[PDB]
UniProtKB/TrEMBL annotation, chain C:
This is Major capsid protein. It comes from Human herpesvirus 1 (strain 17).
Length: 49, 49, 49
């Protein structure tokens, strides 16, 4: 059919809501990205952690 | 708790207990203890989505 | 429904910040003003000890 795309696995806990997955979401669980930040030096890591 | 001008309860061992029970872990409560005269402020969130 | 087709949960544990603040027992703005017009007397069976 073509080249085989490589699946993955990330150990996430059981009782999270499935409603986080019925939408376009981030696999990390928390919203990442430098687009979301503000005007400060350390916002990009502040979004992450 | 952002407002000011309500009579707090008597037990100062218990009045601080509620303020550390609602503001601690909240999107809205103050970071600095409230200014006694002016206006409290909302903590600067890392990102706006 | 939210903005981006969300299933947002809103429950009683979000209603802590309006009830736990001790202004729910601010009473004397009521008792000090309801006794302005002289009111009659009902049966004093439950109001006397």
């Amino acid at each position: 059919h073509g080249q085989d795309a490589v699946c993955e696995f990330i150990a996430t806990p059981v009782s999270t809501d499935v409603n986080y997955f019925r939408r376009p979401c981030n696999p990390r669980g928390r919203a990442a990205g430098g687009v979301y930040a503000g005007d400060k030096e350390g916002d990009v890591t502040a979004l992450m952690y | 708790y952002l407002g000011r001008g309500a009579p707090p309860l008597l037990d100062n061992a218990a009045a601080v207990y509620l303020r550390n029970a609602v503001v601690a872990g909240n999107r809205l409560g103050p970071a600095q203890p409230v200014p006694v005269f002016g206006c409290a402020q909302v903590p600067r969130r890392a990102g706006m989505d | 429904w939210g903005k981006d087709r969300q299933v947002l949960r809103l429950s009683l544990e979000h209603a802590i910040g309006t009830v736990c603040h001790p202004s729910l027992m601010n009473v004397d703005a009521a008792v000090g003003g309801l006794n302005r017009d002289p009111v009659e007397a009902a049966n004093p069976y439950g109001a006397y000890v």
